[PDB]
Enzyme design. Structure first.
Site, PDB file in Angstrom:
ATOM      1  N   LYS A  61       0.882  -1.196   0.000  1.00 61.67           N
ATOM      2  CA  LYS A  61       0.000   0.000   0.000  1.00 61.67           C
ATOM      3  C   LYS A  61       0.900   1.220   0.000  1.00 61.67           C
ATOM      4  O   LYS A  61       1.868   1.271   0.763  1.00 61.67           O
ATOM      5  CB  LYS A  61      -0.921   0.012   1.226  1.00 61.67           C
ATOM      6  CG  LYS A  61      -2.162   0.902   1.066  1.00 61.67           C
ATOM      7  CD  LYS A  61      -3.090   0.254   0.049  1.00 61.67           C
ATOM      8  CE  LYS A  61      -4.579   0.382   0.329  1.00 61.67           C
ATOM      9  NZ  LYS A  61      -5.381  -0.500  -0.618  1.00 61.67           N
ATOM     10  N   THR A  74      -3.816  -5.590   0.442  1.00 62.89           N
ATOM     11  CA  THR A  74      -3.171  -4.305   0.651  1.00 62.89           C
ATOM     12  C   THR A  74      -4.036  -3.490   1.611  1.00 62.89           C
ATOM     13  O   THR A  74      -3.508  -2.717   2.398  1.00 62.89           O
ATOM     14  CB  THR A  74      -2.921  -3.515  -0.654  1.00 62.89           C
ATOM     15  OG1 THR A  74      -4.184  -3.113  -1.227  1.00 62.89           O
ATOM     16  CG2 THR A  74      -2.108  -4.390  -1.679  1.00 62.89           C
ATOM     17  N   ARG A 103      29.221  33.965  -8.514  1.00 62.52           N
ATOM     18  CA  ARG A 103      27.902  33.603  -9.068  1.00 62.52           C
ATOM     19  C   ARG A 103      26.932  33.294  -7.935  1.00 62.52           C
ATOM     20  O   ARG A 103      27.322  33.135  -6.776  1.00 62.52           O
ATOM     21  CB  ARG A 103      28.023  32.401 -10.010  1.00 62.52           C
ATOM     22  CG  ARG A 103      28.464  31.133  -9.285  1.00 62.52           C
ATOM     23  CD  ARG A 103      28.453  29.924 -10.222  1.00 62.52           C
ATOM     24  NE  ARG A 103      28.715  28.714  -9.427  1.00 62.52           N
ATOM     25  CZ  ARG A 103      28.690  27.464  -9.885  1.00 62.52           C
ATOM     26  NH1 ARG A 103      28.464  27.232 -11.184  1.00 62.52           N
ATOM     27  NH2 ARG A 103      28.927  26.445  -9.035  1.00 62.52           N
ATOM     28  N   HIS A 148      19.893  27.369 -11.899  1.00 58.49           N
ATOM     29  CA  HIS A 148      20.653  28.469 -12.474  1.00 58.49           C
ATOM     30  C   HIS A 148      19.925  29.794 -12.409  1.00 58.49           C
ATOM     31  O   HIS A 148      18.724  29.842 -12.636  1.00 58.49           O
ATOM     32  CB  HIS A 148      21.005  28.145 -13.919  1.00 58.49           C
ATOM     33  CG  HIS A 148      21.714  26.834 -14.075  1.00 58.49           C
ATOM     34  ND1 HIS A 148      22.963  26.598 -13.543  1.00 58.49           N
ATOM     35  CD2 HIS A 148      21.335  25.678 -14.682  1.00 58.49           C
ATOM     36  CE1 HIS A 148      23.343  25.360 -13.842  1.00 58.49           C
ATOM     37  NE2 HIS A 148      22.366  24.777 -14.518  1.00 58.49           N
TER      38      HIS A 148
HETATM   39  O1  LIG Z   1      -5.938  -6.919  -7.125  1.00 54.97           O
HETATM   40  C1  LIG Z   1      -5.708  -6.746  -5.920  1.00 54.97           C
HETATM   41  N1  LIG Z   1      -4.527  -7.192  -5.431  1.00 54.97           N
HETATM   42  C2  LIG Z   1      -4.194  -7.098  -4.138  1.00 54.97           C
HETATM   43  O2  LIG Z   1      -3.091  -7.514  -3.712  1.00 54.97           O
HETATM   44  C3  LIG Z   1      -5.174  -6.439  -3.224  1.00 54.97           C
HETATM   45  N2  LIG Z   1      -5.203  -6.169  -1.909  1.00 54.97           N
HETATM   46  N3  LIG Z   1      -6.409  -5.543  -1.669  1.00 54.97           N
HETATM   47  N4  LIG Z   1      -7.155  -5.426  -2.830  1.00 54.97           N
HETATM   48  C4  LIG Z   1      -6.431  -5.969  -3.817  1.00 54.97           C
HETATM   49  N5  LIG Z   1      -6.648  -6.131  -5.136  1.00 54.97           N
HETATM   50  O1  LIG Z   2      29.268  23.730  -9.729  1.00 53.08           O
HETATM   51  C1  LIG Z   2      29.173  23.402 -10.920  1.00 53.08           C
HETATM   52  N1  LIG Z   2      29.498  22.131 -11.254  1.00 53.08           N
HETATM   53  C2  LIG Z   2      29.477  21.682 -12.515  1.00 53.08           C
HETATM   54  O2  LIG Z   2      29.777  20.499 -12.796  1.00 53.08           O
HETATM   55  C3  LIG Z   2      29.039  22.639 -13.575  1.00 53.08           C
HETATM   56  N2  LIG Z   2      28.894  22.568 -14.907  1.00 53.08           N
HETATM   57  N3  LIG Z   2      28.459  23.813 -15.316  1.00 53.08           N
HETATM   58  N4  LIG Z   2      28.340  24.681 -14.245  1.00 53.08           N
HETATM   59  C4  LIG Z   2      28.691  23.999 -13.147  1.00 53.08           C
HETATM   60  N5  LIG Z   2      28.762  24.327 -11.843  1.00 53.08           N
END
Ligand SMILES: O=c1[nH]c(=O)c2nn[nH]c2[nH]1
Ligand SMILES: O=c1[nH]c(=O)c2nn[nH]c2[nH]1
Ligand SMILES: O=c1[nH]c(=O)c2nn[nH]c2[nH]1
Ligand SMILES: O=c1[nH]c(=O)c2nn[nH]c2[nH]1
Ligand code: NA
Ligand code: NA
Ligand code: NA
Ligand code: NA
Ligand SMILES: [Xe]
Ligand SMILES: [Xe]
Ligand SMILES: [Xe]
Ligand SMILES: [Xe]
Lengths: 295, 295, 295, 295
Positions: free
Chosen positions: A10, A57, A176, A256
């Site tokens: 789930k 589930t 920068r 950037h």
């Molecule tokens: O198709 C399903 N598979 C599952 O494992 C399941 N568990 N609850 N409902 C379900 N439906």
């Molecule tokens: O910090 C950076 N690392 C990089 O690998 C890079 N490539 N372009 N600008 C960059 N700046």
């Protein structure tokens, strides 16, 4: 044909929990989004329409609420480990659980300089996340992360001395703007099981706080030679402060901001030392990654 | 057929401006997204393919950068008024300019308890906005707003005594979670022109701060009888604190958090006084609006 | 202070309805998102905490499902009118209902060249919308629209002869890419009530289809002198084909695709007649609007 | 500390290319979003601030446009392989290139039942994607995929016979709505280099078309025992139709539509065989994955 890998569960299960201190009247809220995917001896549900192996589930969803009712939900590393362990202990044929948790910020409001007992604000879309993989017979692997931390510095970033060939138009620069959204992940050493995870509980919040602080301080203070150089300094410090982390990974967009030449209009000066107005660029963006581990 | 109304211009123009104090070395950044739409004697561009009346939208974009270069960009009410006035003064056949500005947060970082000179963080997606309509011969109408302010209180909200009929299933409650995203707009009295807007410049930031503070305090302190009742209290206070505002409008979603009955599972108690785990609902949501003005 | 305007209700109510033909076995699905906001004698809920006047938004949600159960949901103009009329007839103190409906596409699948009885595909995020305002004693005002229709033509668009001054850098062009997301709204003459809306039911789907067809054909065939000129031609044709429409409004972004000069690299020719590779621009964008009505 | 892994490059590079047939006057457009990340002997840019090893991300952006100018951009598997190979052949110290391409739909318009020469519509947000990893000395690995294909069937889906325990509330069903967004990936056998990729060029478009067709037909015709069972049938057929594919992976959300019990209102019947109006659920959702390979 054969099933080589399968997982199901789930996703997007929103959960809120409130803690009420009866003494002080102070309330604290937690809100998360949870995903749980299971693996095990479930191939026949795919190949033979055998639903007998499927933990629905919908039941997984129920289990998340029940587990949150009966256990603390913080730190998320502990809650995720409890939740993952549950499935492998409860169901004989389930042998792995993968739990992802995103924690949303609800920060206590200050009204007239004092902390309010039960009102909260979402101060930024920054998240604290965990990925917990609980694998039967192999323990618990935890990756913790922060994401959505958006920062900018307006000077003290440089980029010169890069390779220049017939594909290069980029000018070298000694001043920068640097702006990024930080995604940082630290991977914990493997834990043998829940008892071991419990024994380290204080380290989880502390390490998150350290990772955040190191990121912010290094970004603000480094006279940055490149994104690469600055992010490495961050990762190095985190590894030095927490021995139980094996690796730190950063993934950083370079968002950037372009100078705008206005000299065509009455000789107006808006480039180099005279640059005041810039055009933020939505795309494309640099993307710089690195994984740092121990020697 | 005839042209009953027409407006055209440039949307989504991102602008960044930096101010550098040469004395202190402190830098301050502003980032906004701007939209400018014009009206006037431009019908023939639609009906006769007469482009001679069109100020190209690309030129409008240029004008935004040029204006930001030559003028302060704060408070946004002043910048928007300068920008709108420009078009009606420069072009004889243009008689209205509509300027929308969204200001993005770049909050100065604190490193080791002191303000950093040139590093910033995006602390939340909360925005401060303005809509400025400059209409030739009718002055300048300004609506200021904050939006994207997301709050939650975990108790001290009630909702009972509503109409009950055959369409009603909702139970009355004396204790619920209340959560909303605040959109609040205050409309200024009409200004005669730029000189008048300039004369009120200090009131713009102050009123924004007041609106924010009143919103947060009232939300946190009101033992709320409904969204309606609480929002009215907010609007009333803002009108009382700033005589130059004519109306205040709030638009508030009611973001529901539902109790989860867990009693089917081993009699677990998670409703009413025992409610700890809740299910946030993504949709549907209540939507409550009101416009408050002077007697 | 006084309440100058107030409206409240439920937003984002997702609804799915299925129709099953028992004879043929053919099933048809409808899915919509609905918003209903009410106005009336409700000031006291804001000013005096008097909830007795509030039809709970949760009850409004219930009413939407009940109404969809008992009535056809197509055309949406009819469903919205039924839904709006309900509130003003049922509740003495409610005097206006505002109903917005977004219809999502579920298009029957063709498998092996034949229409499948019960499987559907979402072919595009294009929507068909209605806004219905039912005001007691003033009838029913309906605005119908299509939105999210994204088109591009790679030639047969021009833009020259615009005003050139000291703010202009844009070059005239006789061949450019034109791309937009179409938002088109047609406003119906006021209807006296539900009986009149029912009497025109066949015109709703037919007019939607005509609006769509005119938009697509005119876009594809017009050797466009500007967005302004082309959109006017669309609106003129729609008004000519349906006498019960009073006004047509178009709102069209101009999504720019920029030439890329590659001549710095080995004299490569990629501009003017040699332009093959372009850079789509995410922002800023032109925005062009017009409302066309009858002489 | 040491660099364990590093990659860097340019993300979100939007590219449009037009092909003009001079004979027929027919124009065809392609639009994509491209990401290129490089690996190689670049550790010193992180650890020693040595920019001499960095091919600037801005240069990578230039290279993408130049490559698109000089080469076909379709099928994307070929374009991605050309682009990846370029970097490993051009730069001695770069040893891997990772290229991701998302292709956006621009479908030729039919006006009056005939194909228009130069006008296009975005019919759905469905994407065709490729991931190409070019690793020096290890050839070219290509994963092709479709994503964003949203379907629904209103009957002929069942789900019963699943595990029932104290965490289960879900009722068995023999008739439900099934709706999903399809993400399907097929992984090609490793190719030795560009010559081999070129030799298989016709198979790329054909296999994409087959994958799409099998997905749609199986979804529409299978009387589905579960998501698991139906998706397995899809994957099995794709593997049978294309011997050069090694594995097929599906990742499928189960987007729930809930019955609405209306019996509280005048005994209205809207469940089981009488179900007509349903509540689509935005979250949570089932998520079901599987990877199918050869015996
Ligand atoms: O198709 C399903 N598979 C599952 O494992 C399941 N568990 N609850 N409902 C379900 N439906
Ligand atoms: O910090 C950076 N690392 C990089 O690998 C890079 N490539 N372009 N600008 C960059 N700046
Ligand atoms: O069609 C256009 N209309 C306009 O108003 C405009 N302005 N710049 N480019 C433009 N194109
Ligand atoms: O505060 C509220 N106002 C309302 O109008 C309403 N309707 N349902 N719940 C509600 N809560
Ligand atoms: Na087990
Ligand atoms: Na004028
Ligand atoms: Na009434
Ligand atoms: Na190489
Ligand atoms: Xe939680
Ligand atoms: Xe700005
Ligand atoms: Xe519907
Ligand atoms: Xe392309």
């Amino acid at each position: 044909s054969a099933v080589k890998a399968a997982r199901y569960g789930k996703d997007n299960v929103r959960v809120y929990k409130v803690h009420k201190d009866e003494k002080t009247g102070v309330q604290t809220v937690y809100e998360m989004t949870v995903c749980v995917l299971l693996e095990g001896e479930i191939e026949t549900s795919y190949t033979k329409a055998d639903n007998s192996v499927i933990v629905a589930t919908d039941s997984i969803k129920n289990t998340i609420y029940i587990t949150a009712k009966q256990n603390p939900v913080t730190p998320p590393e502990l809650f995720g480990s409890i939740l993952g362990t549950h499935f492998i202990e409860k169901y004989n044929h389930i042998h792995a659980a993968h739990v992802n948790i995103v924690c949303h910020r609800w920060t206590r409001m200050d009204i007239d300089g004092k902390p309010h007992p039960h009102s909260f604000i979402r101060d930024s879309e920054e998240k604290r996340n965990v990925q917990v993989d609980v694998v039967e017979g192999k323990g618990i692997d935890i990756k913790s992360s922060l994401s959505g931390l958006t920062v900018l510095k307006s000077t003290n970033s440089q980029f010169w001395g890069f390779l220049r060939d017939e594909y290069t138009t980029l000018k070298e620069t000694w001043d920068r703007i640097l702006s990024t959204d930080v995604d940082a992940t630290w991977q914990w050493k493997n834990f043998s099981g829940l008892q071991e995870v419990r024994s380290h509980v204080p380290k989880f919040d502390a390490t998150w706080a350290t990772a955040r602080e190191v990121t912010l301080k290094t970004f603000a203070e480094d006279n940055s030679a490149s994104v690469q150089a600055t992010m490495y300094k961050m990762a190095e410090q985190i590894l030095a402060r927490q021995q139980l982390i094996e690796t730190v990974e950063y993934s950083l967009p370079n968002k950037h901001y372009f100078e705008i030449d206005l000299s065509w209009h009455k000789g107006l000066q808006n480039t180099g030392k005279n640059a005041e107005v810039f055009a933020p660029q939505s795309d494309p963006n640099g993307l710089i990654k690195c994984t740092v581990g121990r020697s």
